[PDB]
Amino acid sequence: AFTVDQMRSLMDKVTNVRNMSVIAHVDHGKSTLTDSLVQRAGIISAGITIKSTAISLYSEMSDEDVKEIKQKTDGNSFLINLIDSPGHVDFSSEVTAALRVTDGALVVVDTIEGVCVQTETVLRQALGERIKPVVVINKVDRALLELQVSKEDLYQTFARTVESVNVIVSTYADEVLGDVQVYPARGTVAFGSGLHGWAFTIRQFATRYAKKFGVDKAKMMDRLWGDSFFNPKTKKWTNKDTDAEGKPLERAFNMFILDPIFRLFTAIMNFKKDEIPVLLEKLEIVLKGDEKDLEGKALLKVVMRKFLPAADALLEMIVLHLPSPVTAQAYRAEQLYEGPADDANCIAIKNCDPKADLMLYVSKMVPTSDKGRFYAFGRVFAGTVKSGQKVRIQGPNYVPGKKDDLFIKAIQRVVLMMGRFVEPIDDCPAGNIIGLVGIDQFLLKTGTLTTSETAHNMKVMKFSVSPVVQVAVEVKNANDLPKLVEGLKRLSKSDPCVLTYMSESGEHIVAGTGELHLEICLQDLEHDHAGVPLKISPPVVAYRETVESESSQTALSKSPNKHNRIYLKAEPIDEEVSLAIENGIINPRDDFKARARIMADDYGWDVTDARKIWCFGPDGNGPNLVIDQTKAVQYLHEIKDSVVAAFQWATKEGPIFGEEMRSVRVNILDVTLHADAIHRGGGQIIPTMRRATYAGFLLADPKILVEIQCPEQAVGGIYSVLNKKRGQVVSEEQTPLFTVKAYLPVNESFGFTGELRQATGGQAFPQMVFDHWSTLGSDPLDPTSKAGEIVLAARKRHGMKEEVPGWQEYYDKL
C-alpha cells in the first residue's frame, strides 16, 4: 500500500521499472499465477471503477542480487506493471496493441501439454514487438501427484519444453537483439505450481549451497543444472554421467534440488510423522503455532511456501532478466515511428526524452462506468502529458500535410490506470503507461497524441483477426430501431475487432473475428449496448440478372393504349466492358464521342452503336445499356425520356426474381407510335419499354479470394475442405508459411472457418473478400437446378408466385 507520492517517486526511477505481461494458452494457469503475484507484491493506494487493465507490483532485491542485474539500476526497489492482454489469439491487432506497451513477457507453459499453438501465437507476436521472454513451466504438481512421473522423465519433459520454446524464439527474434533464447542455468526458466505458492531458480539454490560446499555460487549454479555430477564416492564434480567403473551417476540438479523436494512431498503426503520433523529441521523450515498440527496437502502447501516462496521465483526473473523504457525505446524508436529516423520526434523517442514534444501512443479505448464514456489507454514515448494540456489528436489516417483525422482539444484529466480504478494525476513523463479522459469522441481504438505540428503518426505477430463471421441483426419490435442503431455504435467503439455495416439488402450486419467473439458481441449488444430484444439470422445473398446470348427472336410489346409498340433484342455485354463501366474506364457522363472511340477501338464495339447509347442502368450508371438502332421513327426524341426511365426501372428490378440486371445490352430495333402525343405519354411508353425489355431479356437465355496462411503439412486440409465446398484453388505461393488463394462461393462459407481449423489441426488462418460476379450455368426458371433453387427460395421468401413468368407473358403478338 503506497501513497500517490510514493508511487510518483517510484515512477521517477524508470531504470527500476518493468513493463510486462503474462503469455499463456487457455487453462495453463495465467490467472492463478497473477493472483499469486498480486497477493505477494500487489500495490494498493494508501467511486469510479474501471475494467482492470493493468496491475502494479512492488519488489525489493538484496544488494547482492541487484549487482547481478545486467542493466542500469538505481537502488533496490522495483515497480512492475503487469499489463493485461486479451485472450483472443488469432494474431489479432488488439493483442499486438497490448504487447506494444510492454517490454518483457512471462510465458507460461504447461508441464504436460507443453507449448501449444496459442502459446506460440502470442509469443510470436511478442517477439515481433521485440519483447524479451522468460518462461515458467507450470502445473508441475500434476506430474508428481497424478502421473507419478520419475525425476529423469520430468527432467526430459522440462528440457523438451524449453527446446520447443527456443525454436520459436530463434525463428522470430530479431538478430540485432542477440541471443534472446531461454536457459534454465541462466535463471530465465522457473518451474512450479501456480495453484499450490512455491517456485525457484537455480540461483537461489546456488546461494543456499555455495556457502555450504565451500564454493562461490557462480560455480555452483553452473553445477546445479545440465550435465554436472557429484560423485559422493570421489567427492568430486564431473561432466560424465558414469564413474570409472561405469556405474550410473545422478545429475547434480536431481540430487541437490529435486531430491529434497521429492522427499518433502513423499514424507508429508504419506504421513511419515517421524520423518517429517527431521527433514524440515535439515532444510531449516520452521512450523509455528497451528501449523505444527497440519498434515497432508495442507502441511505441504504451508511447508513449500516457507521453503521456496512462487511469487519469489517469478519476481526474480522479472527484475533480473526482463528489460526496463530507456533501454528499449533506444532500439524500438524507428519501428514505432512512421516519420523520419533523423526526425526530432524519433530522437525524442530513442532518448525517452520527457522535455521534448509529446509523442503519446493510444493503445485502446477502455470501458468505464462513467455513463458510456471510454478512457484512452496508452504510453508516453516522448514529452510529458498534463491535465488540461492542449494536444493534437491524430487518427489512423492523419498526415502532417492534410487536416484528416486531426483533432486539437485539451486533455481533461490524466489518470493512473490501476486495475479497475483510476487516480487523477497532474502529469506523466515519457516512459510511463497512462490513461487519458476526454479523448472518447476523437479517437476510437489506436491513435497518436502530439504537441508538435511536425509530429508524424506511430505501428503490429504465427487467433483470427478478420471479421469472417457475420449475421444480420434486427429489432423484434419495430419501434426499437433507434436503440439498435445506437447500440451498434456503442458496440463498435468498445470493440476494435468488431464490425457493423448496412448490407446491400438493407440489413444491419454485425461481424466478429470468430463464432465465439461474435456471440459475446451479440450478447453485449442485445443486453447492454442496445438493451432491446434482437432477432438474429443469416445474411441474404444478393444476385444479378443477366443474359447469356442474343434474344432468340425480336421482342415485341405494346402499350396499354395498344397504339404503341417497341421492337427490341437483348444481348450479353462482355465482362471486360461491364468491369470497365463499374470501375471508371467507361462512364455515363463522359463525352459520348471519345467514349465511343474507346468502346469501338479498344472493346470491339461498333462505333455507331456506341455513339448511340441512350443510357446506363440502373441508377443511370449501371453496367447495362440501351442502344438506339432505329432508322426512321418520327417522334423518337419525344419518347427518349420514357424509354430511359423504363430502363432504369427494368435494370433495377429484373424479371427472374427482382434482382438487378448486370451485363445486359438492349438494342431498340424499331418503334411505332401514335401520331398524337396524348397517347404516347410516359404512362403509355414507360410500361411498353419495361415490358419489352423483360421480354427481350427472357428471350435471351436468362441466367443469374480466400487467402489462407498455414504450414506446409497443413495445406492438404485446405484442398480437402475446398473440394467439399465447390471451391477452387487459385495460387500456392510462399521462409515463412504458405499462402493458398482460392475462390469460395459465399453461400458455402458459413461455418467454413470451423471446418478449416478442423481439417488443418487449427493451423490454417482464413481471410475472405468479395471477388466476383460469376454466372451460374443452370436454368434460373427450372425450380430444381442450382440457380433455380436459389430463385425459388427468394420468390417464396418474398411472397411472389413460385413459377417465374416466361417471356410469352411480356410478348404482344402482332
Partner: protein, 35 residues
C-alpha cells in the same frame, strides 16, 4: 507483492475470471489487467 507494498490491490482468482461467460465455461475469455 502486496505484502511488500500496501499500494498494491490484491486480486483473487475469481476477481480476474469474473465475467459471467468465464464462469460458465470455466476458462478465461477476456484479457484482464492487474497492477
Amino acid at each position: 507483492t502486496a505484502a511488500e507494498n500496501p499500494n498494491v490491490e490484491v486480486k483473487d482468482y475469481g476477481d480476474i475470471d469474473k465475467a459471467p461467460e468465464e464462469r460458465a465455461r470455466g476458462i478465461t475469455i477476456n484479457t484482464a489487467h492487474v497492477e
